[PDB]
């Protein structure tokens, strides 16, 4: 079977600049009968199915912007996106259909660069409904920041927490090229009610010093 290998696995490119993704096949995917490379490119956004961009290595599908171009022959192929736009954030895949089984490359994620954006930081105490059930989830939201690196630390009565929080980050947003992050601290009801001050401390390139959001259990 033909192994499809993409390079790089991820890249970050500035808007209006060129993005180049490579795909190499373990053997030739040139079909002699019509002298076409049976090589296709797809774009996939999160939660969405793949969308066809290019087939026969270099023919654009109708509706696809002309900033997308494919080139290569035989075993070495390239997808070039010129004048990159925000809506081009996605994972790109190559696929061959010369040989059965049809096979795909492993994807290349494309992200975009932008200026630093500090997070807006928000905190949510657990609901009384959840506490009644025996557990407290405390949520610290870091909204719309860039770059993706951030430090997030929980303090409970000023004690740094370890091993009891969970961080989830969104994929980069097309509308403003930012990320958002949720940090959820999980405590039993009994531990939640032993302490009063709940704080999440966020450090980020866009913050001139770390930001703390906190609340006092029980207070307005």
């Amino acid at each position: 079977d033909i192994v499809m290998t993409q390079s790089p696995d991820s890249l970050a490119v500035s808007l209006g600049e060129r993005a180049t993704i490579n795909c190499k096949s373990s053997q030739s995917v040139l079909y002699s009968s019509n002298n076409k490379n049976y090589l296709t490119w797809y774009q996939q956004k999160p939660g969405q199915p793949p969308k066809l961009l290019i087939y026969w290595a270099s023919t654009r599908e109708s509706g696809v912007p002309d900033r997308f171009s494919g080139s290569g022959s035989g075993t070495d192929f390239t997808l070039t996106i010129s004048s990159l736009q925000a809506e081009d954030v996605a994972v790109y895949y190559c696929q061959q259909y010369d040989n059965y089984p049809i096979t795909f490359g492993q994807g290349t994620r494309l992200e975009i660069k932008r200026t630093v954006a500090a997070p807006s930081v928000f905190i949510f105490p657990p609901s009384d409904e959840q506490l009644k059930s025996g557990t407290a989830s405390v949520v610290c939201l870091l909204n719309n920041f860039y770059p993706r690196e951030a430090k997030v630390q929980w303090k409970v009565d000023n004690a740094l927490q370890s091993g009891n929080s969970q961080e989830s980050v969104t994929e980069q947003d097309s509308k403003d090229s930012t990320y958002s992050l949720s940090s959820t601290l999980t405590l039993s009801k009994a531990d939640y009610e032993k302490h009063k001050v709940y704080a999440c401390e966020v450090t980020h390139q866009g913050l001139s010093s770390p930001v703390t959001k906190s609340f006092n259990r029980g207070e307005c």
Binding site: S33, T40, Y100, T170, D173, S180
Partner: protein, 231 residues
Amino acid sequence: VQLVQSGAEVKKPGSSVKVSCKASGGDTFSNYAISWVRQAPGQGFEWMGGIIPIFGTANYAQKFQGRVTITADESTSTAYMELSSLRSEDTAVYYCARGPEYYDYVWGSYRYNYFDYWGQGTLVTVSSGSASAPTLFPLAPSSKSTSGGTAALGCLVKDYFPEPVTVSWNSGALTSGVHTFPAVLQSSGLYSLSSVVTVPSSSLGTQTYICNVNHKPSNTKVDKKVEPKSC
């Protein structure tokens, strides 16, 4: 051209699943091929097979041959992929995809090529765990979630199994500023995620905000109102 698949399911190891894909505007069932491709969570793609509906002939990847059947019903423009003796490793989003055919002058046959339309996908989870509905808890807007003229509020979507959930706000009327985070599988064997939205803080006393969650694997839908904190 539209390809609509059946919903997400949990299946026990050793069982079989049948996924459907209905095409609507047929040109598709008369002149095209329909393939099935799967994508394990967090990974790439594996072709399982395809069929050319007007001929009834179907090819399959070696690794599925014997265990997979692809059929197509021209009177309902619906194609199906049945996969049997399910194993953990069969957990994936299964896609149907349409594409044109070319003729191979050496084989003397029509063959599959590129896919031009994909369906939305069907997440099939193979697990001995039972499905479980989510519980929705509010992330109430308050002084600690407001800045300038903006407030954040949200929905904690807790303790469900397996993936996926769909989360909407106000029956899909509210889409701007929404972030639904990727679920994390908890030590308990259950998933949780939050969904949040930023809105004008001036709206909080007058606009209702409801979190709508659909969990197809447990056949549950939940709606929860999220109201501002009141002291």
